[model samples]
Target: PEELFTKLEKIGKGSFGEVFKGIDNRTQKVVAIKIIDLEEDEIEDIQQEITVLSQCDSPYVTKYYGSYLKDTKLWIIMEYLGGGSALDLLEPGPLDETQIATILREILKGLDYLHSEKKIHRDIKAANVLLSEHGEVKLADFGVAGQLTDTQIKRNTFVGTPFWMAPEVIKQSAYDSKADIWSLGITAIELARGEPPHSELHPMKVLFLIPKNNPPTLEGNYSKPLKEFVEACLNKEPSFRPTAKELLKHKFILRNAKKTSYLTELIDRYKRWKAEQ
Candidate 1:
């Protein structure tokens, strides 16, 4: 492989690795590259992540441009999200209702596409969300993503953050993509509250909040329709939780997602907005 070199700028960092912005020498196009250590041969995991990402045909999902492998690292070229992490907006303050809904709607649409293809995101959190200046949201990170095959088969691996996990998954009982909906519910609350409810509670306390415990209180803080939708999605039992597709139909998302005029209008509006630069 060519010697590692580029005008790389660190944009974000996490447990898996760091993300950098650079131009592809081959294509000379701007791209955000994620640097992850294979540590071992994880071609299957990488391929799975790509498969799920490639199946998503939504404007909300970050476009997977290409990838370069060097030594033991993988450099993934993705659509540049200049807006940075979704966590950036959550901190300091919560997003206003309209903005929150707009982001959640698009995020779920991209996720819905993945679920429709029978793949599990496995991880969902504010940090995993990449936001662009145009107000676009896309889910990222797929180190532990899995494909769903059996309807009720159980897997015994620990994957994803505890606070964001669906109870079924947290308990290691067979899970489905309904897990994503549950995570979304928690994420929605996190967005509105600027953190998880009773976030300071001990991990055990938060762990006990599902199923046998009460749903996190929305308390009008997340808006009426959005709160109700969160409740529906946060149902501890995966079977009761709505699918990403179903959530898209929920009032919270469908309220303003235009069916026909949205594409042309959204495209034109963003193009105009971009031209303003």
Candidate 2:
């Protein structure tokens, strides 16, 4: 299996491993390969991630091909999306409302699919959102994802990035899929302002402020629908937050829905900007 793929350059680093842009020699298809070092302590987590990933099948979610063992390392192969991430796109500058709307709509679709299948992304941030060359958006990184069985509908795990976490999640309260809506709200703010609220502070500090302080809201010049959409998502009460399916019908998402192909402009802009750097 090791001979089947040619690992290229490192593209990213996850909590458990390094990601590479690789190629399948047999099919000549480009793929993202995550190589994780095996340790007695981390085997369970690794298997859990693989189980979650293998169960997922959606256009809005990244595709997982297979995994292989090479000595002490595990190589997990996934679909390659050349457009980088929504976070990377922000390097060219913050996205306009239109672009944010398009991206959020796609993310909501992804969340809708995941939630319906009794899965919680747990981590929903700009960096976790991937895009293809053709402007297809997909959710990546199932490292911290959690699956819900019919018997268990809520999770009390303290997972996810601090800045994008829901208040209830930060508080370690029993949280369900609505937690993702809160993170989605924060991601919208990130897209608009170039970062999440209180990003200036250390993550640990922000963690204390999230549950104790008022929920962050979209600031500066933005449309009413857009602001309202963000507000609907940032509700401190998890029960008050709209579900991904409900958010799909939000005015901002509905009105600003654009062809996925439209996102190609942002990808092109990022590419041209990267070339200059």
Candidate 3:
């Protein structure tokens, strides 16, 4: 916000805005800058998002720094994840099973916090997730998160990435944090199957497959428990999806959680090498 951010290269673009990587002068760390096209709804939505992020104090989510307006644009500042998106690890194709488990274990921990806090990450996908040098996850882009209610009528909204969407959400019925569980499952397959869950097919075909067919096969690259973990995540029934807390107990994650954090420290060192080179 303000001159606190020294603008860097553009990162990504969406329907009504742009995201850029910048350095925060106060913290002397990089942060992400999101600018939106001036609009009443967008501005109000931006304020609402900031209010929500300010209240979420969890390692699983992005650390919101502050916000401001300038040059007739709104600037939202957030943690600068050094390792980029998980897509960075998929360039040569899907990683091995151990690698898949590492990514899932990290994500499940993040989701556990969000769900337990009674917040819904309406949109969950690779592009929205940021990776840290410490091998931690910074769940960013909460432009779509909403609060959960105890009412029997569940919140219904058209949100999240296409292939990653749970059947219940796409079915146009009410859904909740369980939708995020389904998305995480897709994320697991993404880590091992290469690219996104349905990355190889036509958009039209994917539209039909996600709701009608079962999760794409894990093949043999993923270990048994890891396969079971993703399968649990992708369970067609949202009610059957594991709660964030429950997933932490899953054998697939608990057994390998240490390794996941270990890789984070290692990855961070590797990331620094890029700056040196």
- Which lDDT tens digits does candidate 3 get at residues 24-113? 787788788887757545665566578878878887788888778886787888777776777654653445555556666667777888
Give all candidates' CA lDDT scores. 0.70, 0.92, 0.74
TM-score of 3: 0.86
In the range 14-119, model 1's lDDT, one tens digit per residue, is 6666788877677777778877777856567677666666665667667776566788787776778766666665554445666667777877887887787677
Write model 2 residue lDDT over 1-277, tens digit each, in one string: 5879999989999779899999999999999999998865767768878898899999999998889999988999998999989999999877877899999999999999999999999999999999999999999998889888899889999999999999898888999999999999999899888889999999999998999999898889999999999999999999999999999999998888799999999999999999999
Angstrom error at residue 1, model 2: 4.3
lDDT of 2 at 163: 95
Clashes of each: 1, 0, 2
TM-score-sorted candidate list, best first: 2, 3, 1
Pairs in steric clash, model 3: 134-264, 135-264
> What's the residue-level lDDT of 123 in candidate 3?
72
* Clashing pairs for predicted structure model 2, backbone only: none
